[PDB]
Write a protein that holds these residues in place. Structure first.
Motif, PDB file in Angstrom:
ATOM      1  N   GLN A   1      36.786  15.010  83.396  1.00 22.94           N
ATOM      2  CA  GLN A   1      38.004  14.255  83.146  1.00 22.94           C
ATOM      3  C   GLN A   1      38.494  14.547  81.739  1.00 22.94           C
ATOM      4  OE1 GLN A   1      38.683  12.946  86.858  1.00 22.94           O
ATOM      5  NE2 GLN A   1      40.019  12.731  85.066  1.00 22.94           N
ATOM      6  N   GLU A   2      39.777  14.874  81.628  1.00 20.64           N
ATOM      7  CA  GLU A   2      40.400  15.165  80.344  1.00 20.64           C
ATOM      8  C   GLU A   2      40.155  14.039  79.341  1.00 20.64           C
ATOM      9  OE1 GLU A   2      44.777  15.367  81.278  1.00 20.64           O
ATOM     10  OE2 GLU A   2      44.004  14.743  83.236  1.00 20.64           O
TER      11      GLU A   2
ATOM     12  N   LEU B   1      41.144  15.068  70.043  1.00 14.88           N
ATOM     13  CA  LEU B   1      41.235  15.520  68.663  1.00 14.88           C
ATOM     14  C   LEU B   1      39.878  15.311  68.017  1.00 14.88           C
ATOM     15  CD1 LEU B   1      42.584  16.672  66.244  1.00 14.88           C
ATOM     16  CD2 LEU B   1      43.628  14.452  65.757  1.00 14.88           C
ATOM     17  N   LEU B   2      39.235  14.195  68.353  1.00 19.61           N
ATOM     18  CA  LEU B   2      37.900  13.883  67.854  1.00 19.61           C
ATOM     19  C   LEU B   2      36.934  15.019  68.165  1.00 19.61           C
ATOM     20  CD1 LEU B   2      34.949  12.572  69.139  1.00 19.61           C
ATOM     21  CD2 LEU B   2      35.588  12.295  66.753  1.00 19.61           C
ATOM     22  N   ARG B   3      37.078  15.612  69.343  1.00 19.95           N
ATOM     23  CA  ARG B   3      36.216  16.719  69.730  1.00 19.95           C
ATOM     24  C   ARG B   3      36.552  17.950  68.908  1.00 19.95           C
ATOM     25  NH1 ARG B   3      32.924  15.794  73.480  1.00 19.95           N
ATOM     26  NH2 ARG B   3      33.163  14.178  75.089  1.00 19.95           N
ATOM     27  N   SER B   4      37.837  18.294  68.849  1.00 20.89           N
ATOM     28  CA  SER B   4      38.256  19.451  68.056  1.00 20.89           C
ATOM     29  C   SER B   4      37.790  19.400  66.591  1.00 20.89           C
ATOM     30  CB  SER B   4      39.774  19.613  68.113  1.00 20.89           C
ATOM     31  OG  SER B   4      40.150  20.405  69.228  1.00 20.89           O
TER      32      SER B   4
ATOM     33  N   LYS C   1      31.665  20.708  71.720  1.00 21.49           N
ATOM     34  CA  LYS C   1      32.556  20.732  72.869  1.00 21.49           C
ATOM     35  C   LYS C   1      32.069  19.749  73.914  1.00 21.49           C
ATOM     36  CE  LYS C   1      30.241  24.628  75.180  1.00 21.49           C
ATOM     37  NZ  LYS C   1      30.436  25.990  75.748  1.00 21.49           N
ATOM     38  N   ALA C   2      32.947  19.349  74.828  1.00 23.29           N
ATOM     39  CA  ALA C   2      32.469  18.522  75.915  1.00 23.29           C
ATOM     40  C   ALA C   2      31.951  19.506  76.937  1.00 23.29           C
ATOM     41  CB  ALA C   2      33.570  17.651  76.490  1.00 23.29           C
ATOM     42  N   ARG C   3      30.630  19.619  76.982  1.00 19.99           N
ATOM     43  CA  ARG C   3      29.970  20.581  77.841  1.00 19.99           C
ATOM     44  C   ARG C   3      30.024  20.121  79.284  1.00 19.99           C
ATOM     45  NH1 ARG C   3      24.322  22.155  75.089  1.00 19.99           N
ATOM     46  NH2 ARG C   3      24.183  22.882  77.261  1.00 19.99           N
ATOM     47  N   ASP C   4      29.973  21.090  80.193  1.00 18.70           N
ATOM     48  CA  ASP C   4      29.970  20.848  81.631  1.00 18.70           C
ATOM     49  C   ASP C   4      29.015  19.719  82.002  1.00 18.70           C
ATOM     50  OD1 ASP C   4      30.238  24.144  81.275  1.00 18.70           O
ATOM     51  OD2 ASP C   4      28.238  23.351  80.838  1.00 18.70           O
TER      52      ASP C   4
END
Lengths: 97, 227, 146, 93, 113, 56, 98, 227
Positions: free
Chosen positions: C35-36, C43-46, C51-54
């Motif tokens: 889910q996006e 932005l918090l991730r960037s 990264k939000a891994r699989d």
């Protein structure tokens, strides 16, 4: 008494205190020496107990000795619980027992 | 008059003391408090951490050994030791037993300052080819602090064990009618102080009196705020 | 780093390891429901850059209040002899966790005569209603429910 | 045994009236961060902590000791609820 | 602590003056709380044997080991000549001191039974 | 995370403890007295203390 | 006594054995019938609730046992006797209302 | 580790003290010694047997006096006094009052080195023309000695009186568990000490610590008798 008079001991004063109290109450027949009084009080299940906090004895005698007891299943280590904000029943937003 | 002080010992284990005469009730006023400090605050020993080559946990079964791991810890906590060096509050101990030999406290490998007062305390009954290796890091402290409370971090397989300090076993003072004195109703103080041998009854009385008078001297200057 | 301490091979905890409540046992890992990330979270991730891994964490931790030590390591993989798992499930694990518990404060206790009770506190060996032989009592029950 | 209890209950008629007063006021004490109160630094609640002995942050206790003086005014239909929020949330940040 | 001992040992007797009963207590002929009679006045042994101008005095006498918590004695408590037991007085003391005036406190409590 | 609670959070917890009191209940709820409010006292152990007179 | 037997919570000797190797895992007893038989031990194994099962070897690494005589104890079974708790001295008195 | 002793007094009579923190059980270890020694020791005023003119029996009623003999003996006991010099441990004071006069403790006829710290005490109410004469023996000591124990007659008809030695009225200490940061295992032990006029609440205390530390130093030289 053998581990008392034999080991190099004698009748304690505090013992006298308790014995006298009993001799007033009737727990120990009067006219009898402390050797006999503490004895009668001994077979009564009771004895002369001191206070490890103070060291002064107890006004009356207290029964003692070995007994069989047991630690039951229920232990606070398990049962005791408290939550703040947890999951809720899918239907209504109530918590879970 | 003056307090005639007597001290009747036996060995490093048993010991008696007498303070006679004394004011009526006074013997009780003095005797029990020192006793109280004695059974508790008296500095001690009797293990810390135990390790065996074949053990990953207190529940493990060591081959060639009738006793279970913690089952031995039963004997280890009860084990009495004394470091002859005041500077050594922590060192280490070693043990090795092979074949059908009775593992006892005496089987431990002797070192500097380490002294066992009960060589005959059974550790484990070993059968044929039963091998055992052991190392206890025994440290000194005071009171009773179970393994749960004190950590160890000696190694992955080494586990903390409950610590029974205070070499004193049991203590019983006594008040009685003494003939030494001017008046009547006086007290002859007696003491049944027992010890495992790490510290003699004399030592116990001495240092207990020290901790006693020390905490007692905390009474010097208060701050008064009257209503 | 540390949260991985006794995992040594297949994501299992070695035998005789203390697991305080809040630690883990096994390593379960599955693809998270994709889910996006919320805008602030994107932005918090960037920013940081993880990264939000699989796959997201799944693995089974330990209950709040059962601190033990691992003893039984029992693994059951799908595809092994004498083990039939549920229809379309992969390897399972049932780990045993044992803990020593001394008598605690408030633990139920009774005699053979049917007298219930909970331990009310404890008491210093120092202060005890002992006897002339210098032997301190170990329990002291009130004569009320007699 | 909250101090002033007897006097507290004795002030108003019912229990609830009192509770309501303590409530609304204790809240008002929070909205302004204690700069409202009719008491003096000696009277204000005192919580003794190891770090430092500050004023007990507990609003409830604040209102509690607050009413004991009587400097506060209460009762229904006191003032228009309208201007009561204009001159209250203004005087203090 | 509020109870009151009466031993039947003494069984009660007629004594001319307090001296008779005086030596009698040590002689075992009478009991500490034994309800006896001196001249025409009826009283117990301890009822005379202990005279406390104030309660704290009694507190000492009993706590020093010269008396028992429950005994019929004589004390002057709260500007009144009393005659009761040490624990009995103790009660009133506790109550009042936990109130902040022992006067009304003791005033509303039964100091007899 | 973990059990690592330092004294820092202990006293900090007591700061919000003092004053306000929590309600303690015992089933069944028969008498309204089956629910009474008491001052939180941080104590050791697991079990829960209470005044012996209100337990009745 | 019999409680631990009929409950089968204890491991006895099927015949008059001879304890050879104690081994707190494998207790072997060479029986009088000439055959050599050993009974493994259940030491520290999970139970249906929390309390594990243990067989504490109480038999010396050699001696001739009797048929029906115990070899290894049980969790509540001490020396072939029902041992629930531990006998303790108790003072009956109101200790500070505790 | 650093127990702070703080004490708040009121006058020369009542005072309270607290030693916080302290190890669990230590406070209890302090309470009884201090208690028994405080009440059974601590030298003080203590008036003994008194004589009265025209009056003999401890019962016979003296005319021109509202109160009877014993009723007065109580006010005589409640009185506190002190010797200006350590050399006079025993004195005698005298009193004579006639007519309708209100006698107080201060109204007593003074002595050589003696000071009554209790100036206002109803001693006896005199009626119209009430005549009275009396002689009191004040001696110094410790503990409590009723009329039975101390025999004294220095006069034709002298009446022995209970001796109120210890200026202390009561003590009854109290311990409790206070917190510190993390650990709650400490003692907040407090003591309520009463004193009449002789020694201030602090003086009684210090003097008690003296009597304690004194006895604690009696353990020095053993006398060895082994079994």
């Amino acid at each position: 008494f053998g581990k008392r008079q034999g080991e190099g001991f004698g009748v304690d004063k505090r013992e006298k205190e308790v014995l006298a109290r009993a001799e007033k109450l009737g727990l120990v027949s009067p006219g009898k020496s402390p050797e006999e009084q503490l004895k009668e009080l001994f077979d009564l299940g009771k004895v002369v107990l001191y206070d490890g906090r103070t060291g002064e004895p107890f006004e009356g005698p207290i029964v003692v000795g070995q007994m069989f007891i047991m630690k039951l299943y229920h232990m606070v280590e398990d049962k005791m619980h408290a939550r703040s904000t947890g999951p809720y029943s899918l239907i209504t937003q109530q918590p879970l027992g | 008059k003056a307090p005639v002080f007597t001290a009747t010992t036996q060995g490093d284990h048993y010991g008696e003391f007498v303070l006679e005469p004394l004011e009526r009730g006074f013997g009780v006023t003095l005797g029990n408090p020192l006793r109280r400090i004695l059974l508790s605050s008296i500095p001690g020993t009797a293990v810390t951490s135990v390790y065996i080559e074949d053990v990953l946990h207190e529940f493990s079964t060591i081959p060639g050994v009738k006793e279970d791991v913690v089952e031995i810890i039963l004997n280890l906590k009860e084990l009495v030791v004394r470091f002859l060096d005041p500077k050594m509050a922590s060192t280490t101990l070693i043990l090795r037993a092979e074949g059908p030999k009775e593992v006892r406290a005496g089987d431990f490998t002797p070192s500097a300052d380490v002294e066992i007062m009960n060589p005959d305390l059974h550790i484990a009954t070993l059968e044929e080819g039963g091998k055992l290796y052991m190392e206890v890091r025994v440290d000194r402290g005071v009171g009773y602090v179970p393994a749960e409370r004190h950590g160890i971090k000696d190694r992955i397989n080494a586990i903390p064990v409950d610590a029974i300090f205070s070499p004193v076993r049991r203590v019983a003072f006594q008040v009685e009618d003494t003939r030494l004195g001017q008046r009547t109703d006086l007290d002859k103080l007696t003491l049944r102080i027992w010890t495992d041998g790490s510290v003699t009854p004399l030592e116990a009385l001495n240092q207990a009196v020290a901790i006693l008078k020390e905490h007692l001297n905390y009474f010097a200057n208060p701050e008064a705020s009257l209503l | 780093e540390a949260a991985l301490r006794d995992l040594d091979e297949e994501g299992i905890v070695r035998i005789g390891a203390e697991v305080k409540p809040g630690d883990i046992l096994v390593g379960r890992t599955s693809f998270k429901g994709e889910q996006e990330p919320s805008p602030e979270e994107r932005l918090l991730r960037s920013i940081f850059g993880e990264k939000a891994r699989d796959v997201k964490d799944t693995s089974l931790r330990v209950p709040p209040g059962e601190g033990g030590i691992v003893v039984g390591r029992l693994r059951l993989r799908r595809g092994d002899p004498g083990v039939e798992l549920k229809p379309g499930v992969r390897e399972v694990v049932r780990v045993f966790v044992a803990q020593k518990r001394k008598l605690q404060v408030g633990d139920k206790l009774a005699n053979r005569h049917g007298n219930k009770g909970v331990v009310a506190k404890i008491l210093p060996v120092e202060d005890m209603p002992h006897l002339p032989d210098g032997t301190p009592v170990d329990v002291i029950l009130n004569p009320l429910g007699v | 045994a909250e101090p002033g209890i007897d006097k507290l209950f004795g002030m108003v008629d019912s229990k609830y009236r009192l509770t309501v007063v303590v409530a609304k006021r204790a809240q008002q004490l929070l909205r302004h961060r204690f700069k409202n109160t009719v008491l003096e630094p000696e009277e204000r609640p005192k919580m003794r902590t190891l770090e430092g002995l500050y004023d007990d942050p507990n609003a409830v206790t604040w209102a509690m000791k607050e009413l004991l003086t009587g400097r506060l005014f209460f009762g229904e239909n006191l003032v228009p609820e309208d201007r009561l929020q204009k001159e209250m949330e203004r005087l203090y940040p | 602590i509020t109870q009151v001992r009466k031993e039947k040992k003494g069984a009660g007797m007629a004594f001319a003056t307090p001296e008779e009963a005086l030596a009698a207590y040590e002689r075992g002929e009478v009991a500490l709380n034994a309800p006896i009679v001196v001249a025409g006045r009826e009283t117990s042994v301890g009822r005379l044997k202990f005279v406390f101008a104030n309660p704290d005095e009694a507190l000492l006498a009993v706590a020093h080991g010269l008396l028992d918590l429950q005994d019929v004695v004589t004390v002057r408590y709260l500007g009144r000549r009393l005659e009761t037991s040490p624990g009995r007085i103790l009660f009133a003391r506790i109550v009042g001191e936990a109130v902040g005036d022992e006067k009304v406190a003791q005033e509303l409590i039964q100091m007899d039974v | 995370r973990q059990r690592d609670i330092k004294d820092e959070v202990w006293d900090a917890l007591e700061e919000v403890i003092h004053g306000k009191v929590v309600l303690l209940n015992r089933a069944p709820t028969l008498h309204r007295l089956g629910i009474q409010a008491f001052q939180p006292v941080l104590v050791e152990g697991q079990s829960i203390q209470l005044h012996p007179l209100v337990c009745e | 006594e019999r409680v631990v037997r009929d409950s089968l919570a204890a491991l006895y000797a099927e015949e008059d054995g001879e304890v050879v190797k104690v081994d707190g895992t494998r207790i072997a007893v060479r029986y009088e019938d000439g055959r050599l038989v050993e009974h493994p031990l259940r030491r520290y194994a999970r139970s249906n609730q929390g309390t594990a099962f243990d067989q504490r070897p109480r038999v010396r690494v050699g001696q001739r046992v009797k048929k029906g005589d115990l070899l290894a104890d049980g969790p509540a079974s001490e020396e072939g006797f029902l041992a629930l708790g531990q006998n303790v001295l108790v003072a009956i008195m109101p200790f500070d209302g505790y």
